[PDB]
Amino acid sequence: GAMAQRMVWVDLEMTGLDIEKDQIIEMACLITDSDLNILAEGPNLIIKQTITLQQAEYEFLSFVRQQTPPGLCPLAGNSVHEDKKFLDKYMPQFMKHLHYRIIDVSTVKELCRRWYPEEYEFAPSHRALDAISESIKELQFYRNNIFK
């Protein structure tokens, strides 16, 4: 039904893309429904190398436990495959609550660029919570402009 089709939107900032040496600097989270309407906003936490990593994982895991069913909803965001690699390593209990599938907005951007080049030319941050809001609007823009 509608609940199993909710999305767990995230945005993360790291020191780099090397999973062995880089760390999660900032993170934000929010839930939407299947039609991208924001149901709830999670926290916007800056992590030390302000709060520690293990506490952010508790904060974020609490937030999604009260908003989504266990192991059902996918992680959503722009280049969220880069974010999932770091969440699978540094927040494994948070990732245990989600599905293995992602709703990656940059996959949709790559298809828009190839298949709908005019729409792509006119396709549309200080916090990680603002970067999520921008990705939702980008995903909503593709739904209206390139999907049937």
**Given the rule CB under 5 A, which residues bind Zn ion?**
126, 131
- Residue 95 phi/psi, 5° resolution? -70, -25
Contact letters for Mg ion, residues 84-103 (x by CB under 5 A): --------------------
- Under rule CB under 8 A, how many of the chain's residues touch its own copies? 31
Contact letters for its own copies, residues 35-64 (x by CB under 8 A): x-----------------------------
Which C-beta is closer to its own copies: that of 99 or that of 127? Answer: 99
**Token duo for residue 6:** 């909710």
Q: Which of 114, 121, 122, 124 binds its own copies (CB under 8 A)?
A: 114
Burial 91-129 (b: 16+ CB within 10 A, else e): beebbebbbeebbbbeebbeebeeeeeeebeebeeeebb
Whether 126 is a known active-site residue: answer yes
The position carrying tokens 């823009």 is: 141
DSSP 47: B
Which spans of this chain sit near Mg ion (rule: CB under 5 A)? Answer: 11
